[PDB]
Amino acid sequence: TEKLTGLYAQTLVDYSGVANTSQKPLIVLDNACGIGAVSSVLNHTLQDEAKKTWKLTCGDLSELPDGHYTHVFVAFGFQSFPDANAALKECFRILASGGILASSTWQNFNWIPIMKAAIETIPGNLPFPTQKEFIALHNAGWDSESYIQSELEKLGFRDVKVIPVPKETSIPIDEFFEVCMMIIPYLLPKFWTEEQRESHEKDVPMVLRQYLQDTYGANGQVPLEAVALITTGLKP
């Protein structure tokens, strides 16, 4: 996964304005080290500061001082929080006046289509989430520019911008297969009867591997295409 989220790490740091802001000293939060675990771009940006008065904190919003930070980053965190609204309220609380929230969330990605295609090789017209069904399983709305803009503005953010950014990369079959099998076990309970699972669950790995080897060569690459929403907002 991390080859693609690393591309979005540069986008999110650039869109936030942190490298060029007049707010000094920089007091930054990287939620759950979501950027730092996949990219050095933010850490390296701070290292390049002439000042040396800046601070970066990595910690988790999902359980910080009031009015403290100049920048809060949430890289692909809002769709996974237990309580996305509570987390957003916390972002507003811990930002200083003039502080910027920058977040990335998923709007589209191609791994659900590829999995669906593999599954419609099984006999039985078996059900599988569509791309929108899958996104909406947790914290629905964070794939919608209009939803996000209103959620941020309700809480007092202004100059709110929500921009879709497509990125494309490629991943080896073996790695793409393993990402799939982290997701499959989580879905089938929600979309198949126990009758359908006992009947077909055990063969999913083989057909998936078979479809993947079928389609993208034997040691080939699988494309990873996505659209992420890049959200920025100002706390007045």
Side-chain angles (χ1 to χ4, degrees), residues 1-2 4-50 52-54 56-61 64-124 126-131 133-173 175-192 194 196-197 200-201 203-218 220-236:
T1 70
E2 310 196 10
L4 181 62
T5 61
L7 295 173
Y8 283 110
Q10 184 73 62
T11 299
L12 188 65
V13 171
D14 291 356
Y15 274 48
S16 73
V18 71
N20 287 87
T21 181
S22 68
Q23 300 295 298
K24 299 272 185 293
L26 304 178
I27 304 177
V28 181
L29 175 77
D30 178 13
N31 171 73
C33 255
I35 296 175
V38 301
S39 174
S40 283
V41 63
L42 177 64
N43 298 335
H44 210 292
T45 294
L46 298 171
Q47 207 184 47
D48 288 351
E49 280 287 308
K52 319 305 196 239
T53 59
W54 54 269
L56 168 78
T57 296
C58 276
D60 202 321
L61 283 168
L64 296 175
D66 280 9
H68 183 71
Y69 293 87
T70 61
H71 294 78
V72 172
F73 292 92
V74 188
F76 301 106
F78 276 112
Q79 286 159 312
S80 298
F81 290 135
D83 187 339
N85 187 247
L88 184 64
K89 288 192 168 61
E90 187 78 344
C91 288
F92 189 81
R93 175 187 71 86
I94 69 184
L95 280 165
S97 176
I100 299 296
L101 172 63
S103 67
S104 55
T105 53
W106 297 112
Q107 184 173 80
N108 297 123
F109 38 50
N110 63 333
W111 40 93
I112 289 291
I114 299 172
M115 283 172 45
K116 165 68 187 194
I119 284 167
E120 67 197 352
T121 65
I122 300 185
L126 290 179
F128 201 71
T130 70
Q131 206 172 147
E133 300 216 88
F134 177 78
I135 300 301
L137 288 181
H138 199 28
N139 305 354
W142 286 90
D143 68 330
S144 162
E145 290 92 320
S146 59
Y147 174 89
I148 294 173
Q149 177 163 0
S150 176
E151 289 304 306
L152 265 72
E153 290 179 348
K154 285 188 293 194
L155 291 184
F157 290 100
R158 302 289 182 256
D159 297 334
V160 173
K161 301 296 194 144
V162 187
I163 303 183
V165 176
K167 297 286 180 184
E168 296 83 34
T169 185
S170 85
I171 176 175
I173 295 179
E175 308 198 31
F176 186 93
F177 171 88
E178 293 303 342
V179 176
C180 286
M181 296 314 310
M182 281 183 61
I183 301 168
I184 290 287
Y186 161 62
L187 290 179
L188 308 180
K190 294 215 156 95
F191 286 80
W192 291 10
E194 309 219 322
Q196 303 179 299
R197 303 173 36 193
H200 283 294
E201 198 170 52
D203 293 302
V204 177
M206 292 86 140
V207 45
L208 179 45
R209 195 180 292 112
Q210 181 64 63
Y211 174 86
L212 291 179
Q213 299 173 330
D214 272 11
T215 305
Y216 302 100
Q221 306 303 62
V222 182
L224 286 193
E225 314 166 21
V227 178
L229 297 183
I230 309 298
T231 294
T232 50
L234 169 70
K235 171 167 180 180

